[PDB]
Amino acid sequence: DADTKIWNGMVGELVYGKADIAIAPLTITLVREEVIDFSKPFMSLGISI
Amino acid sequence: VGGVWWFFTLIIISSYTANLAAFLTVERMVSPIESAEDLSKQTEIAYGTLDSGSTKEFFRRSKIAVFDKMWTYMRSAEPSVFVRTTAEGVARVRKSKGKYAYLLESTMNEYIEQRKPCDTMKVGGNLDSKGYGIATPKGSSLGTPVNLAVLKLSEQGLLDKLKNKWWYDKGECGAKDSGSKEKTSALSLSNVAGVFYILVGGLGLAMLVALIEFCYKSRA
Amino acid sequence: PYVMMKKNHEMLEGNERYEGYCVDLAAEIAKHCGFKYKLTIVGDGKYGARDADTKIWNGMVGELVYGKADIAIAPLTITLVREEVIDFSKPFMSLGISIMIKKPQKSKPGVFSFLDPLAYEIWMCIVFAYIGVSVVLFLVSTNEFGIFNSLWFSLGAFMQPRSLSGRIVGGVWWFFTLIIISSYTANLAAFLTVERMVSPIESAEDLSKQTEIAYGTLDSGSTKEFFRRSKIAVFDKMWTYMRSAEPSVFVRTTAEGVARVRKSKGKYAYLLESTMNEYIEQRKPCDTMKVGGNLDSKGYGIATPKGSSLGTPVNLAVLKLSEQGLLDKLKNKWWYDKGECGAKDSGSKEKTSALSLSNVAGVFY
Amino acid sequence: VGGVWWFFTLIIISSYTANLAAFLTVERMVSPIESAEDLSKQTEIAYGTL
Ligand SMILES: O=c1[nH]c2cc(C(F)(F)F)c(N3CCOCC3)cc2n(CP(=O)(O)O)c1=O
Numbered sequence: 205d206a207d208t209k210i211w212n213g214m215v216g217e218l219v220y221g222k223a224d225i226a227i228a229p230l231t232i233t234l235v236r237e238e239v240i241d242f243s244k245p246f247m248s249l250g251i252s253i
Numbered sequence: 254v255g256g257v258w259w260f261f262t263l264i265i266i267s268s269y270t271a272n273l274a275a276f277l278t279v280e281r282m283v284s285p286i287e288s289a290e291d292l293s294k295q296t297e298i299a300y301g302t303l304d305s306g307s308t309k310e311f312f313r314r315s316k317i318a319v320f321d322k323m324w325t326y327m328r329s330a331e332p333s334v335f336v337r338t339t340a341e342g343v344a345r346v347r348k349s350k351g352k353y354a355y356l357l358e359s360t361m362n363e364y365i366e367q368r369k370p371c372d373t374m375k376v377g378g379n380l381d382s383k384g385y386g387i388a389t390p391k392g393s394s395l396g397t398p399v400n401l402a403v404l405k406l407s408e409q410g411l412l413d414k415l416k417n418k419w420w421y422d423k424g425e426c427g428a429k430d431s432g433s434k435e436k437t438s439a440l441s442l443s444n445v446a447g448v449f450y451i452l453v454g455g456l457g458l459a460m461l462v463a464l465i466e467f468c469y470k471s472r473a
Numbered sequence: 474p475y476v477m478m479k480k481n482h483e484m485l486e487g488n489e490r491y492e493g494y495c496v497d498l499a500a501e502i503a504k505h506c507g508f509k510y511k512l513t514i515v516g517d518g519k520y521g522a523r524d525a526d527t528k529i530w531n532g533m534v535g536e537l538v539y540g541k542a543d544i545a546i547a548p549l550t551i552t553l554v555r556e557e558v559i560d561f562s563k564p565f566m567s568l569g570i571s572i573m574i575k576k577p578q579k580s581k582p583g584v585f586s587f588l589d590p591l592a593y594e595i596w597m598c599i600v601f602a603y604i605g606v607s608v609v610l611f612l613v614s615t616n617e618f619g620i621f622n623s624l625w626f627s628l629g630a631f632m633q634p635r636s637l638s639g640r641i642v643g644g645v646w647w648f649f650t651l652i653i654i655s656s657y658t659a660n661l662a663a664f665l666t667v668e669r670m671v672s673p674i675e676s677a678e679d680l681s682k683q684t685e686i687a688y689g690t691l692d693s694g695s696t697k698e699f700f701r702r703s704k705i706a707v708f709d710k711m712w713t714y715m716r717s718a719e720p721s722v723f724v725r726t727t728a729e730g731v732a733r734v735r736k737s738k739g740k741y742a743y744l745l746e747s748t749m750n751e752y753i754e755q756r757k758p759c760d761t762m763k764v765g766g767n768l769d770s771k772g773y774g775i776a777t778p779k780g781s782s783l784g785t786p787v788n789l790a791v792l793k794l795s796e797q798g799l800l801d802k803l804k805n806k807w808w809y810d811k812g813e814c815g816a817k818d819s820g821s822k823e824k825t826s827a828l829s830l831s832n833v834a835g836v837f838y
Numbered sequence: 839v840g841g842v843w844w845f846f847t848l849i850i851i852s853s854y855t856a857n858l859a860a861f862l863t864v865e866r867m868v869s870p871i872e873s874a875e876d877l878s879k880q881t882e883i884a885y886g887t888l
């Protein structure tokens with residue numbers, strides 16, 4: 205959230221110590237790589253028709 | 254009379270032949286899509302994305318040639334080509350008789366293709382390169398271990414195996430994909446069949462006139 | 474097309490000597506990380522392997538571990554064996570193993586170009602109804618007298634008084650054949666207008682289900698070792714075939730493999746990295762094409778010595794470049810834009826026309 | 839012989855007719871450059887400036 209500058213969802217629960225690890229279809233984005241750590245991709249994808 | 258009638262039927266059968274050819278020539282002209290560039294080069298088939306998400310924001314910020322034009326279209330397309338949820342998008346594709354295409358994540362798409370009534374399919378390669386990963390708090394102890402674990406699983410083909418288990422095996426369809434093989438691709442017997450029934454009908458009519466004729470003769 | 478020697482490289486020096494995807498990717502990374510660099514080609518010209526005996530790393534991965542270089546910007550595959558000794562940034566290009574076949578060419582008459590317009594099923598029924606009329610007429614007109622007549626009605630069949638019965642039979646049968654020959658003519662015209670030539674089917678599973686078209690991989694490399702170690706259903710059978718296929722379905726180099734596909738008239742398929750494959754498709758004489766999706770999920774990355782300062786910076790830089798679509802842009806620049814071939818342009822080329830003899834020949838025999 | 843020869847000529851005249859239809863259909867398919875966008879959509883005809 206731009207205003208409150210607060211992280212939500214799984215990425216949030218990681219930064220605020222709610223969880224120890226996140227195992228889900230979490231996209232590896234630059235904005236997230238800055239606050240948390242992403243392991244190598246376990247599934248490559250993209251936009252399809 | 255016989256000459257003019259002959260010239261008359263000549264024109265008609267020629268017209269029938271010529272006309273029947275245009276319907277078959279165009280029938281071949283039809284070329285389903287396959288790539289994203291195909292969506293931009295045409296307008297007959299509408300298309301859109303989710304009203305909110307990285308998918309929509311992708312085209313908006315994309316400076317790539319093809320994707321640019323696509324966004325320009327979707328940005329002012331009426332009615333709204335954007336849907337509220339992913340379910341709405343799929344429903345729009347299933348109820349437009351192939352007049353509406355929906356752009357979404359390949360992962361979720363591939364899964365939908367393996368769900369009843371098996372009436373959806375992914376076409377062409379992906380538009381961009383993304384990837385999911387295991388997230389761990391910055392400077393965690395599980396960091397390095399998990400990272401290597403993912404690499405180990407992929408090399409053992411365990412990751413590919415898991416996907417096959419939940420995407421294709423879990424199906425199911427598993428049937429709609431074997432019919433989508435795209436085998437057939439020619440003319441047909443249907444039309445020609447209609448002319449066969451009218452033939453046998455004529456033969457039967459004659460077989461009736463024969464007996465009937467005989468009877469008449471006898472009477473005489 | 475990652476790193477190549479520029480045309481007039483002899484008249485140039487420094488980094489200006491080289492050009493390619495990675496050459497541009499280097500400048501981009503250096504711009505976002507803020508540093509000057511000197512492009513250098515690895516000595517032995519290898520990527521990154523580990524000799525079992527000497528336990529020594531070679532190629533770029535080697536020059537990193539032994540302090541010869543500060544960073545590796547090349548199509549270096551992100552493997553577990555390497556991730557242990559060095560650091561890999563997020564993938565700047567996802568790839569996998571693909572299939573390469575000949576150019577979807579086309580050519581063949583075999584009187585079978587006449588039975589196609591008209592389906593085999595239709596040729597059959599038109600023959601069944603053919604004798605179906607010569608038998609009905611046969612009933613209109615002692616054992617030999619039936620043979621001479623059956624041969625006469627068969628001559629009245631072999632196509633060209635007022636017995637109303639068999640009269641309407643000849644008329645209806647004429648109207649029947651009229652429609653058919655009209656359909657054949659019309660349909661054949663459509664064929665002569667569009668004239669689209671498909672091909673086989675993209676799906677590694679298609680290579681295993683058939684044997685007519687041979688296929689193989691490089692005699693040495695991760696590609697070959699993949700099938701050997703793969704426990705997946707489809708890939709298993711494929712390896713079983715290639716493992717004992719005679720003659721050898723494996724080639725010495727990648728060039729040999731491509732040459733084998735271009736000289737087998739579509740009888741030999743070659744399995745290789747999608748990246749190199751896509752590039753080949755964009756090279757003269759444009760007679761090769763990639764079919765189906767990749768067999769596995771790989772990815773190249775920027776390699777940096779374990780515990781380096783450029784580590785985190787470069788990692789983020791790669792992610793930034795991809796999100797700005799700069800990576801996709803670079804690939805398009807060296808693969809398709811700088812390419813020479815064309816597929817969507819060959820289908821957009823509405824032009825062609827000429828009669829041969831093949832089809833007509835089948836009717837002569 | 840007369841029957842087979844008839845079926846033979848039938849196919850040929852049908853082929854001639856069908857093919858001749860294609861030579862006129864394609865003759866219409868051909869389009870000439872009307873604007874600049876036409877120069878970009880095709881490659882057969884090269885073009886340049888000073
Ligand atoms: O980390 C993320 N991972 C995601 C994974 C998936 C899925 F593919 F379902 F696993 C999806 N969907 C795709 C289809 O529509 C329904 C949900 C959204 C994701 N989003 C939201 P974005 O902002 O639209 O990318 C993320 O943020």
Ligand SMILES: O=c1[nH]c2cc(C(F)(F)F)c(N3CCOCC3)cc2n(CP(=O)(O)O)c1=O
Nearest residue numbers: 520521548549550694695696727745746748749
């Ligand atoms: O790090 C690696 N990066 C590689 C990059 C490429 C290319 F795609 F050309 F860039 C290739 N080729 C693919 C086509 O055949 C010719 C060479 C091999 C690579 N290998 C050897 P592997 O053991 O067979 O994977 C590596 O080890």
